[PDB]
Amino acid sequence: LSFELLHAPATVCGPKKSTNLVKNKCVNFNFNGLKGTGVLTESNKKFLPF
Amino acid sequence: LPQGFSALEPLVDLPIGINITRFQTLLALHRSGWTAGAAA
Numbered sequence: 001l002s003f004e005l006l007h008a009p010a011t012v013c014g015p016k017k018s019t020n021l022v023k024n025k026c027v028n029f030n031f032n033g034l035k036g037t038g039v040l041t042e043s044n045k046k047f048l049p050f
Numbered sequence: 051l052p053q054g055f056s057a058l059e060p061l062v063d064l065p066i067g068i069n070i071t072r073f074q075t076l077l078a079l080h081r082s083g084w085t086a087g088a089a090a
């Protein structure tokens with residue numbers, strides 16, 4: 001198995017990580033590379049699919 | 051073109067990384083020689 005590095009997005013890699021979500025507590029979080037800190041709550045907003 | 055307003059839904063994203071400079075459309079032709087219906 002040989003790995004190549006070229007001028008490309010280079011999206012060839014396995015699992016990043018996974019964890020369980022806890023609500024109603026102040027905590028840091030990282031979703032899809034987006035970092036943040038706060039308290040998570042159930043949201044009644046209806047997002048569009050995209 | 052009709053009036054009114056309507057937003058456009060994003061559909062496809064492709065990481066191709068190539069150069070595009072010129073293009074052409076493609077149609078479908080059927081023989082009954084060949085007949086094509088109205089289209090704009």
Ligand SMILES: *[C@@H]1O[C@H](CO)[C@@H](O)[C@H](O)[C@H]1NC(C)=O
Pocket residue numbers: 068069070
């Ligand atoms: C398209 O862009 C790439 C990146 O700079 C370049 O290597 C290539 O020569 C370009 N294509 C043309 C036809 O100039």
